[PDB]
Amino acid sequence: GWGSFFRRAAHVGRHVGRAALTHYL
Look at the alpha carbons of 15, 16, 20, 23 in this order and tell me if their dihedral is positive or negative.
Answer: positive
Domains: count for the chain: 1
Range of the domain at 10: 1-25
Letter for the amino acid at 8?
R
Contact 11, 17 (CB under 8 A): yes
Cβ atoms of residues 25 and 19 within 8 Å: no
CA–CA separation, 25 vs 15, rounded Å? 14
Amino acid identity at 23: H
DSSP-assigned states of every residue in the chain: --S--SGGGTTTTSTTTT--TTS--
